[PDB]
Amino acid sequence: REKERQNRLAEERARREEEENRRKAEDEARKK
Secondary structure, eight states: OHHHHHHHHHHHHHHHHHHHHHHHHHHHHHHO
8 A cells, every 4th residue: 555655646746747847848848
């Protein structure tokens, strides 16, 4: 159960991270 929880939270973190990455990408694109 602990590893399930930790992995779920970890994928949530990584998904938020890729959200911010694509976000900064589209920001730079607007700068272009």
